[PDB]
Write a protein that binds this ligand. Structure first.
Ligand SMILES: Nc1ncnc2c1ncn2[C@@H]1O[C@H](COP(=O)(O)OP(=O)(O)OP(=O)(O)O)[C@@H](O)[C@H]1O
Ligand SMILES: Nc1ncnc2c1ncn2[C@@H]1O[C@H](COP(=O)(O)OP(=O)(O)OP(=O)(O)O)[C@@H](O)[C@H]1O
Ligand SMILES: C[Si](C)(C)COC(=O)NCCCC[C@H](N)C(=O)O
Ligand SMILES: C[Si](C)(C)COC(=O)NCCCC[C@H](N)C(=O)O
Ligand SMILES: [Mg+2]
Ligand SMILES: [Mg+2]
Ligand SMILES: [Mg+2]
Ligand SMILES: [Mg+2]
Ligand SMILES: [Mg+2]
Ligand SMILES: [Mg+2]
Lengths: 267, 267
């Protein structure tokens, strides 16, 4: 009555966090699979009858309303960006993040972060809008990754940011606090450091990094024409979903043809 | 008192459809530019004070609510897809659409359409959901294009589709009709033809193609495991915005760092 690795992997695809089912109790694979298949078909039928919204889409909409209502302008900027942005962000051609970049043709890449486009918007909008400038964006970003439990190659970033008055550590933490309180997600702030921005305030849920946040100014500002105080933070939406729904693997949360709202589509 | 091409191009960037300003009345460039700059700064200040929603984001949300309320499941599938999907869609390696594909690395590409991922979802969901299967997706798609007035290289597609009962020409036209009536956009349906799907019902606003729609079955179905009647239609959101806002160029509607809700960001 032992299960093979293939059998265990199939049952794990079909298992969901709310289940409490022992995969190696000695019940045969056929019965465990049939039970989980029936649970998951019922779950998908209930989604189709009663809500029909995609978790990533619904969370984006929820986050958008939060930031629009707090005075931030909603941005939708290019996902396909100049490759020259990477070197200008101080991503040394090197190894690290630089090796994670998906190149497109000769001179383009898929953005790995929203920051460069938002920096350009802060600079441009400061010529027309009253102080402070508050903007945010949600959308796809791309990195080649090796890991699998907390990393996706195609994921969804929120970055909000502000330039002008009010760009203090305490106001940044207060926005993060109000935001994650709105989502019902507990967290702590820990110092960390990265090659692009320097010191970061990392927003942690246990050992899971939900965000890196930054208080400017930083030396990179000159190369982007940023010449005022600023604050900003980038969050992964699939990581937020992973926490909210207690997923074991971030792939449950991803754009995917393999899962719908964390339910296997292989039924 | 004549304007150069550079001067005329600058004024056209700053002009908006609601203006009624003659660029070559003989008023000097400096006064025309100052007047338009003041109008556009006021327009952006009003957006920032009172709405703050991005046109593409807001239209996606409006469309999503429409289709969710009509019983369609909201899908968010990969934008970065296998290159093998292109050949399997019958996009002959050839010239035409095939030359329009943005390749990523060796084996991936940016999707040029939502159809292949939605075909996979229809097939998979038919194993779990009751007839008919109704799904839709909105999101970025990518084509190398030459044109500039009605084409973008990075644009936003809506595709809705249905499989099972009810997949008739009359029901397809009725959905299109209810949808564009909800948006307030007049249209007509004209026959056309394309290499992937064959005969299409093209949804036209004047000479502007808003959508191609298709009544299955088609011979491509076998290669995607589709084995029931189906209907579907793909719409460009920036083209819908172009019509709604009377933009002269689709770039006003695009993801862009150069325009915000059709207003130049170069102020
Ligand atoms: N590959 C990925 N998949 C999913 N989410 C990610 C990925 N990379 C980054 N994020 C999310 O985006 C946020 C901001 O990006 P940032 O550059 O700080 O990530 P990071 O420090 O490289 O994250 P990690 O150390 O976990 O790799 C991260 O805190 C995380 O929530
Ligand atoms: N490059 C583009 N930019 C903006 N919208 C586009 C683009 N290509 C297609 N669309 C939109 O997507 C819809 C469905 O795609 P489809 O493949 O039918 O386009 P198409 O027939 O190639 O359009 P066209 O003949 O105008 O090039 C189109 O009706 C249009 O509204
Ligand atoms: C020219 Si700048 C990149 C140095 C300053 O202005 C911005 O572009 N603001 C949004 C991004 C800030 C960092 C982001 N918060 C993060 O740590 O993920
Ligand atoms: C395996 Si199929 C591609 C042959 C059938 O099922 C679907 O994938 N449905 C959505 C896409 C249909 C065509 C789209 N409406 C268009 O003309 O843009
Ligand atoms: Mg990382
Ligand atoms: Mg980190
Ligand atoms: Mg980080
Ligand atoms: Mg075309
Ligand atoms: Mg056409
Ligand atoms: Mg067409």
């Amino acid at each position: 009555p032992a299960l093979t690795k293939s059998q265990t992997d199939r049952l794990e695809v079909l298992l969901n966090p709310k289940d409490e089912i022992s995969l190696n109790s000695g019940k045969p694979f056929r019965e465990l699979e049939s039970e989980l298949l029936s649970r998951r078909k019922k779950d998908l039928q209930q989604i189709y009858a009663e809500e029909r919204e995609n978790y990533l889409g619904k969370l984006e909409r929820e986050i958008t309303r939060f930031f629009v209502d707090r005075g931030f302008l909603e941005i939708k900027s290019p996902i396909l960006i100049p490759l020259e942005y990477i070197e200008r962000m101080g991503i040394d051609n090197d190894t690290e993040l630089s090796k994670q970049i998906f190149r497109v043709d000769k001179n383009f890449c898929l953005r790995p972060m929203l920051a460069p486009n938002l920096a350009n918007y802060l600079r441009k909008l400061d010529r027309a809008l009253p102080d402070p400038i508050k903007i945010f964006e949600i959308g796809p970003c791309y990195r080649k990754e090796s890991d699998g439990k907390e990393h996706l190659e195609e994921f969804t970033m929120l970055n909000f940011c502000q330039m002008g008055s009010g760009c203090t550590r305490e106001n940044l933490e207060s926005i993060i606090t109000d935001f994650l309180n709105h989502l019902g997600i507990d967290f702590k702030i820990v110092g960390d450091s990265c090659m692009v921005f320097g010191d970061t305030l990392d927003v942690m849920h246990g050992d899971l990094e939900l965000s890196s946040a930054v208080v400017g100014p930083i030396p990179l500002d000159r190369e982007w024409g940023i010449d005022k105080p600023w604050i900003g933070a980038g969050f992964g939406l699939e990581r937020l979903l992973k926490v909210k729904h207690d997923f074991k693997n971030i792939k449950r949360a991803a754009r995917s043809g393999s899962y719908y709202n964390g339910i296997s589509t292989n039924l």
